[PDB]
């Protein structure tokens, strides 16, 4: 039967709903939360723009190599372990943003499992200084 469009529809629905969820999550935020989030976009895009060549070489070590996850987590978190500076956190976040930007045909879960749990906790630790580094 007509089954040559099944995988296409399957891929688009796992994109549509995820984009609707994001809209729903962004909908239940006040003007302050939206202001901070907007600063994150412009900040991370600025770094990925001016440090694209640096990120690219770091990416080439992380990506093309067929190694399991969490190896990547321990690979990246080391910067957050020694230095708990907001600048390092922002630099780390921008790099993850680059990875998620290049892994479009890969599973969304493969990127989120790197971000969530212990990693997002460390970036959030003393986040008041993190915001003041971005919002000023």
């Amino acid at each position: 039967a007509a089954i040559e469009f099944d995988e296409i529809v399957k891929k688009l629905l796992n994109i549509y709903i995820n984009d609707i969820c994001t809209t729903g999550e962004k909908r239940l935020l006040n003007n302050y939360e939206k202001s901070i989030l907007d600063r994150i976009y412009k900040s991370c895009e600025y770094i990925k723009k001016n440090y694209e060549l640096d990120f690219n070489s770091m990416y080439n070590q992380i990506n093309i190599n067929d190694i399991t996850t969490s190896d990547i987590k321990s690979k990246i978190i080391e910067a957050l372990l020694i230095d708990s500076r907001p600048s390092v956190k922002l630099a780390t976040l921008s790099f993850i943003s680059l990875i998620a930007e290049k892994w479009g045909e890969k599973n969304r879960a493969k990127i989120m499992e790197i971000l969530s749990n212990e990693i997002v906790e460390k970036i959030s630790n003393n986040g008041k200084d993190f915001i003041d580094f971005i919002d000023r």
């Binding site: 770094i47 440090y51 070590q61 910067a79 907001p86 600048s87 390092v88 630099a91």
Partner: peptide
Amino acid sequence: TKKLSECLKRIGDELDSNM
């Protein structure tokens, strides 16, 4: 052997260097 840790620190250093 190309430590991403060292690079991220170096990037973070150049970031807060500008004020």
